Design an enzyme around this catalytic site. Sequence first.
Site, PDB file in Angstrom:
ATOM      1  CG  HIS A   1      -0.516   0.467   2.475  1.00  0.00           C
ATOM      2  ND1 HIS A   1      -0.206  -0.370   3.529  1.00  0.00           N
ATOM      3  CD2 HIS A   1      -0.353   1.730   2.940  1.00  0.00           C
ATOM      4  CE1 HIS A   1       0.155   0.353   4.575  1.00  0.00           C
ATOM      5  NE2 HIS A   1       0.076   1.630   4.247  1.00  0.00           N
TER       6      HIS A   1
ATOM      7  CB  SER B   1       2.549   2.478   6.137  1.00  0.00           C
ATOM      8  OG  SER B   1       1.318   2.441   6.842  1.00  0.00           O
ATOM      9  N   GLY B   2       5.060   0.373   5.981  1.00  0.00           N
ATOM     10  CA  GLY B   2       6.161  -0.164   5.204  1.00  0.00           C
ATOM     11  C   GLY B   2       7.400  -0.469   6.009  1.00  0.00           C
TER      12      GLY B   2
ATOM     13  N   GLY C   1       2.309   6.872   8.509  1.00  0.00           N
ATOM     14  CA  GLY C   1       3.644   7.293   8.159  1.00  0.00           C
ATOM     15  C   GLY C   1       4.723   6.306   8.545  1.00  0.00           C
TER      16      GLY C   1
ATOM     17  CG  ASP D   1       0.219  -3.788   2.905  1.00  0.00           C
ATOM     18  OD1 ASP D   1       0.690  -3.378   1.817  1.00  0.00           O
ATOM     19  OD2 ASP D   1      -0.069  -3.022   3.862  1.00  0.00           O
TER      20      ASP D   1
END
Length: 223
Positions: free
Chosen positions: A40, A177-178, A175, A84
């Site tokens: 995402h 994320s990942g 923020g 994801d």
Amino acid sequence: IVGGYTCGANTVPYQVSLNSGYHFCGGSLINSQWVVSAAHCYKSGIQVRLGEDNINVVEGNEQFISASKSIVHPSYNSNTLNNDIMLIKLKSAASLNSRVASISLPTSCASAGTQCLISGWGNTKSSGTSYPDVLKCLKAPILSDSSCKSAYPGQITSNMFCAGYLEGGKDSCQGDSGGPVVCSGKLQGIVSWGSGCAQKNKPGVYTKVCNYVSWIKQTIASN
Ligand SMILES: [Ca+2]
């Protein structure tokens, strides 16, 4: 990161910032030319920033390397966030030393109760918005599959796990994320989603990296 602490400059040497004019997601360096992040987080025009602490100040250990290709998992479903995960290849290899280093992939799936390090440049507030500029850290346990599914009925797949605190107050957030969830020196999770941040009975949900080791290795071996 809500309720965490200031990591310290370059203490999380596999943590990268994905920049497209601004930081928009974290990622983890897994070898000198590959980063793993959340699907995402996908966009074109990514520059990977290694060696970062304050992402708004050039402090002297940065490496700025543009992405040559991004590979979203073939089964990524953005509605459910199942699968994801994405891989980002660097146009040139990062130079590796103590402040920039790859994180090992897991040999097995970590168990509920294991404490992990979660890090990122995301929002530090659950009610409101404040972004920290320097890297923030959180130590948090993996939660049981049953507590995870009880917190999020109908939403937790076999490719997801919860980590954090059911009481709330400490969590990753927008923020982050990942970015990484690291346990016993191995990348076990990717910051993926959650209902708000640091809310009671709404822990963080993370992509289960151990399910993807074969895909990551074979993808890297042919790209
Ligand atoms: Ca910097």
